[PDB]
Amino acid sequence: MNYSYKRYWEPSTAEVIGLSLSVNTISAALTYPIEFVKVRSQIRTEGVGIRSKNLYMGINPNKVFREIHATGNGLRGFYQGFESHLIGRLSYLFIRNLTYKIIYDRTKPVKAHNDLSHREKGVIAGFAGGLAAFLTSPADLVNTRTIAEGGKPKEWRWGYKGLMDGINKIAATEGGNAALFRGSYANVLRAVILNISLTGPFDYLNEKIWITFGDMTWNKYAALLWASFWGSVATLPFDNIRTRLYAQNADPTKNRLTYSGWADAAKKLIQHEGISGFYVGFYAFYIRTFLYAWTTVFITDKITSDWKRKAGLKEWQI
């Protein structure tokens, strides 16, 4: 399988940057209401957890969607904080893709039919994602605070009208630029886990489906569904803890729980909610992951195949 790779065309840095920015802008614009619903579902069950039983376990995404719509802001109410979300996502992708491209170009094998093993690429992707998430933690924090407010009491809300406005308010009120990096280690852990939980499961099932059913067209999409499931299983606890740390107010009075760090948040989640309290909003997180990944993979594959056909690559090399 180490001879099985197909890297006869390597996109340049400009191509990867532009394509990533555009395609991921589209993907993030499509699934932002799903992310909003997931964050709200995680917020509403902080000290409570999952209290239903059997098939009712968890929080219904459609119920949260209906409540947020019945608020009265319509679908535009699901895109509040989208400026912060988009800027943070684009900055994270820029930094991660630049670092990954540099370290890959320094380390990729000579032969076009060879590539780094999933462990080496996983190390590179984890380092890149950790760095990019550490640098974009202020934007992620502003976005999560914008989403979380609304499911919180009036005196507990921050009232952010933008990304720069939120950053200025955080720096001025809480104090210092270290305030912008509240819960940044949680974001680093989430990005490290997310960057290693998707490439592994996808290639596994994709190649196994090929071995079983030959070269059909549904193989990559079934593998994408499987990879999305396993990435959601691995990443959701870290996303939950990051949401808890981001949404915590500076005043200890204005908090259902007070967390002094990542470990403290995990401990107080296990104490009050149990283990199953980590996986709240799993359906929303998995659906958003699958839709985002499908949109990105589909559009990127179309564009890159069009580029390859103009580069003279043969059909089996595309």
């Binding site: 209290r51 239903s52 009712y56 929080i59 071995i211 079983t212 059913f213 030959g214 043969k314």
Partner: protein, 207 residues
């Protein structure tokens, strides 16, 4: 030991199973002794007496809506209680049977994900066998492809010889007789290209 998070009234995040509206398996005693059934009147048949009343006509089609009575919900197990009651203190508990009937081992239902696994058991078993074990062989379930031109050898796949046979006097006459179907492919460059009406996939590239 009251936790409002476990209370369906205070905690609005506890979704209600409407099919278990009147049934609380937590309060089921073992053996069951509750009486939830009795005579029901004044729904369509009044409990009053109008047999000889000439000024009163009974119209049961005017029946009023009442609270729907759901089918009884089966008992749900209590893990700690069941483990404690069925636990035996080996070598210090007498091997005997208690006089009370509450010592009976009552069966209570439990989780449903196990039965989710059970429901897909035929699919999982057939998939396991045929796909996972790759039975009868690897190539059976794969999407069918013809071999490339003269692959692996002309002794097995004599595509060029058949192409020449169909394009000669004898081949043309045999096709004219109607007992032989027309040629199903064309050798363009060094590639065997099957016609659309042939109803087969194209051969895979020799990578």
């Amino acid at each position: 030991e009251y936790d409002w998070r476990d209370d369906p009234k205070v905690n609005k995040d506890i979704e209600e199973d409407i099919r278990d509206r009147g049934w609380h398996p937590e309060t089921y005693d073992f053996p069951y002794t509750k009486k939830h059934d009795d005579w029901v009147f004044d729904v369509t048949m009044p409990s009053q007496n109008y047999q000889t009343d000439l000024t009163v006509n009974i119209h049961p089609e005017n029946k009023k809506m009442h609270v729907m009575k759901q089918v009884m919900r089966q008992s749900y197990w209590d893990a700690e209680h069941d483990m404690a009651h069925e636990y035996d203190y080996e070598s210090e508990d007498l091997d005997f049977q208690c006089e009370s009937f509450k010592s009976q081992h009552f069966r209570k239902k439990g989780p449903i994900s196990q039965y989710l696994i059970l429901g897909l058991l035929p699919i999982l078993y057939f998939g396991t066998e045929f796909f996972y074990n790759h039975y009868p062989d690897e190539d059976y379930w794969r999407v069918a492809h013809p071999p490339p031109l003269d692959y692996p050898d002309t002794d097995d796949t004599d595509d060029t010889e058949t192409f020449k046979d169909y394009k000669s006097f004898t081949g043309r006459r045999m096709v004219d007789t109607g007992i032989v179907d027309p040629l199903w492919y064309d050798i363009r460059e060094g590639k065997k290209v099957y016609y659309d009406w042939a109803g087969v996939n194209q051969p895979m590239e020799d990578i």
